[PDB]
Amino acid sequence: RVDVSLPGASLFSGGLHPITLMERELVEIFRALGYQAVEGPEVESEFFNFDALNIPEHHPARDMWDTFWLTGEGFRLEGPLGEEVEGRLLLRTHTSPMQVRYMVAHTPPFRIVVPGRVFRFEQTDATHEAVFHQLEGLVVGEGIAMAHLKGAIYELAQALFGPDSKVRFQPVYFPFVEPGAQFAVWWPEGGKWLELGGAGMVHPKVFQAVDAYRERLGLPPAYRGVTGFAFGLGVERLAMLRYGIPDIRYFFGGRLKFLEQFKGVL
Amino acid sequence: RVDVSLPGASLFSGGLHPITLMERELVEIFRALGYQAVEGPEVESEFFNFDALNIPEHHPARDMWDTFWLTGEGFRLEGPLGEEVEGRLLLRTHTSPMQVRYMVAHTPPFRIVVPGRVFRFEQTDATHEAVFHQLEGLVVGEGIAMAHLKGAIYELAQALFGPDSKVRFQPVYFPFVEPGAQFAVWWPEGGKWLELGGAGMVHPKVFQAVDAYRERLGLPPAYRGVTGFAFGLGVERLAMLRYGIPDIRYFFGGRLKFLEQFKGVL
């Protein structure tokens, strides 16, 4: 005979990382609203991470970002046009610089969503990491308004949580956005308000910064008569609610017994 | 020693079928405009394939569709609501029925794109099949207009052919659409006008047909005060231009030496 239940040639089954799944659903969701996804460098200049986003030196707004400062000689940190950029080096504290980046290299109107690994000098506990992921949004063009920001988030929420879901917007402060705002989503099987991310209408001084950088690069102004809305949305938090993960520290851990648990998901 | 160029354990490399690639790029393209993809049955009723699309019996418009008629006893052909449907059975001559299908089961506004295998009694040569694939579009809702149909196609063309591309619209006749139209795209590296598919503003008698079927099913009217645009776009043709395939007969052929040639593509 040939015992037909007898285990077969055990080949390797691959899998994706929790964050990858979550990042994916995220971009998939936004690309159906016409957002295209681009990435940026993890090692950034202070000019892109801070100055171009209206976060100035010795300003009390920089305390929202506990920053890793890097040193090192002979390291080409390439700018939006591949030009060699100078400036005091650091690790991205948010993906936000990518939108100054992108705006210099392209022209309105556009929709983009940018994922990335981001860094903060913070104490690794169970609901906090020193290294985690953000997903940015930027929609710039003539006529764009805050109604469209709300619309986007409303759309995000509908897709991540179903019809029984609703979104909440509250004023809050970011230097690179005014009117600024924090947004929360209502998740039915939890009866809970999720603080998801921050957002707003991209700040006049940001547009100014990019058009200025443009000139230095010899490019034409492109952001004098357009408006925009950006948002920043933290991904681990969201992945935790979705896959039911009790501890953020797991993501960076390497535990196969952990990773393997996600082979199924789609 | 250990000769390190010496071929390694030869494992199996998989691949996708030319049509699958083309179907995919297609849906990917349209899902970024907010179209969602649904499918329909390959075995259809005359009511869905013809009557509900304003293609009546012994009408000279049915000659655009050389049809396979099926016979057979004890075969549940399930309708939009899973209800057992009756009617003279055939093979889909186009994917178009799917939009009557969908409209009965859902309510406006929506964007859908429907791929499918479709059949025609025709002589298998090099630029013709008896079995090939179509990709349908349907965008229905308040305010929808022909400008939006053109916009869609313009968008399709931009993405399949680059900026140097342009689209051409000419009046043409379909019973399920008026104003009706054929559309062609301009493909630069070919200096050629591609006749891609047909389209138009979904016909008043179609909306009427679905709302009528709805009543029979006990559902409420949903298409009295909405407009719509559909399009039908043949996929093999497009795949042939893209992957450079000289002969449609290859798609249904099974030649590994042929299929294997497409493992790379993305």
Around Cβ B42, how many Cβ atoms within 10 Å?
13
Q: Are B149 and B160 in contact (CB under 8 A)?
A: no
N- to C-terminal Cα distance for chain A? 37
Closest residue on chain B to A27 (Cα): B32
Structure tokens at A16: 């994706």
What CA–CA distance (Å, rounded) separates B250 from B244?
A: 12
What CA–CA distance (Å, rounded) separates A205 from B73?
A: 73
Structure tokens at A29: 């969701």
Q: Are B90 and B13 in contact (CB under 8 A)?
A: no
Range B252-259 contact pairs with CB under 8 angstroms and sequence separation of 24 or more: B252/B129, B252/B131, B259/B15, B259/B17, B259/B18
The alpha carbon of B176 is separated from its chain's Cα centroid by a whole number of angstroms, namely: 15
B83 is in an annotated binding site: no
Q: Which residues, listed in sequence order, are joined to residue A14 by a DSSP beta bridge?
A: none
Backbone angles phi, psi at B147, to 5 degrees: -55, -35
Which candidate, B200, B99, B100, places its Cα nearest to that of B153?
B200
Strand ranges of the sheet holding B110-119, from the earlier edge strand across to the other edge: B36-37, B110-119, B131-141, B227-234, B192-202, B177-187, B167-171
Around Cβ A223, how many Cβ atoms within 10 Å?
22
Q: What DSSP letter does each residue of B241-266 carry, written as one string? A: HHHT-S-GGGTTT--HHHHGGGSS--
User: How far, CA to CA in Å, does B61 sit from each of A26, A85, B56?
Assistant: 46, 66, 8
Q: What DSSP letter does each residue of A34-102 carry, written as one string? A: T-EE----SEEEHHHHTGGGT--TT-TTGGGS-PPB---SS--EE-TTSPEE-S-EEE-SSSTHHHHHH
Q: Which residues, listed in sequence order, are joined to residue A139 by a DSSP beta bridge?
A: A111, A229
Question: Half-sphere exposure of B69 toward its Cβ, with a 13 Å CA cutoff?
Answer: 4
What CA–CA distance (Å, rounded) separates A176 from A187?
A: 29
Q: Which residue in the block uniquely carries the two structure tokens 């999720």?
A: A194
The secondary element (H helix, E strand) that includes residue A6 is none
Query: Of the listed A100, A177, A209, A210, which one is catalytic?
Result: A177
Q: What DSSP letter does each residue of A169-213 carry, written as one string? A: EEE--BTTEEEEEEEEEEETTTTEEEEEEEEEEEPHHHHHHHHHH
Local structure of residue B142 (DSSP, 8 states):
T
What CA–CA distance (Å, rounded) separates B238 from B31?
A: 18
Q: Which residues of A touch B36 (CB under 8 A)?
A: 32
Q: Is B190 exposed, middle or buried (0-12, 13-18, 19+ CB in 10 A)?
A: exposed
Characterise A28 by phi-psi region: left (phi > 0), alpha (psi -120 to 50), beta (else).
alpha
Q: Do A34 and B33 touch (CB under 8 A)?
A: yes
Q: For chain B, which domains are there?
A: 1-266 (3.30.930.10)
Local structure of residue B10 (DSSP, 8 states):
-
Q: Are A101 and A92 in contact (CB under 8 A)?
A: no
Range B171-175 contact pairs with CB under 8 angstroms and sequence separation of 24 or more: B172/B198, B173/B61, B174/B198, B174/B200, B175/B53, B175/B54, B175/B55, B175/B59, B175/B61, B175/B203
Question: Half-sphere exposure of B202 toward its Cβ, with a 13 Å CA cutoff?
Answer: 29
Q: Are A3 and A251 in contact (CB under 8 A)?
A: no
Around Cβ A150, how many Cβ atoms within 10 Å?
16
Which candidate, B113, B122, B98, places its Cα nearest to that of B42?
B98
What CA–CA distance (Å, rounded) separates B107 from B102?
A: 9
List the determination method: X-ray
Shortest CA gap A198–chain B (Å): 24
What CA–CA distance (Å, rounded) separates A236 from A214?
A: 34
Residue B231 contacts by C-beta under 8 Å, 6 or more apart in sequence?
Answer: B136, B137, B149, B152, B153, B183, B197, B198, B199, B200
Residues of B with CB under 8 A from a CB of A: 31-34, 36
What CA–CA distance (Å, rounded) separates B118 from B94?
A: 6
Closest residue on chain B to A35 (Cα): B32
What CA–CA distance (Å, rounded) separates B1 from B261?
A: 36
**Is A158 designated active site?**
no
Cis before residue A179, ω within 30 degrees of 0? yes
Q: Do A31 and B34 touch (CB under 8 A)?
A: no
Amino acid at A221: P
Q: Are B168 and B186 in contact (CB under 8 A)?
A: yes
Backbone angles phi, psi at A47, to 5 degrees: -60, -45
What CA–CA distance (Å, rounded) separates A182 from A170?
A: 5
Residue B219 contacts by C-beta under 8 Å, 6 or more apart in sequence?
Answer: B104
Q: What DSSP letter does each residue of A16-46 carry, written as one string? A: --HHHHHHHHHHHHHHTTT-EE----SEEEH
**Is B249 designated active site?**
no
Q: Which residues of A touch B9 (CB under 8 A)?
A: none
Closest residue on chain B to A155 (Cα): B34
Backbone angles phi, psi at B254, to 5 degrees: 85, 0
Q: Which residue in the block uniquely carries the two structure tokens 């199996």?
A: B12
What CA–CA distance (Å, rounded) separates A123 from B4?
A: 46
Q: Which residues of B touch A32 (CB under 8 A)?
A: 31-32, 34, 36
Axis-axis angle for helices A18-31, A235-243 (nearest 10): 110
Helix H segments across chain B?
Answer: 18-31, 46-49, 97-105, 146-161, 204-216, 235-243, 256-259
Q: Are B112 and B95 in contact (CB under 8 A)?
A: no
Residues of A with CB under 8 A from a CB of B: 31-34, 36
Q: Are A113 and A74 in contact (CB under 8 A)?
A: no
Backbone angles phi, psi at B135, to 5 degrees: -125, 115
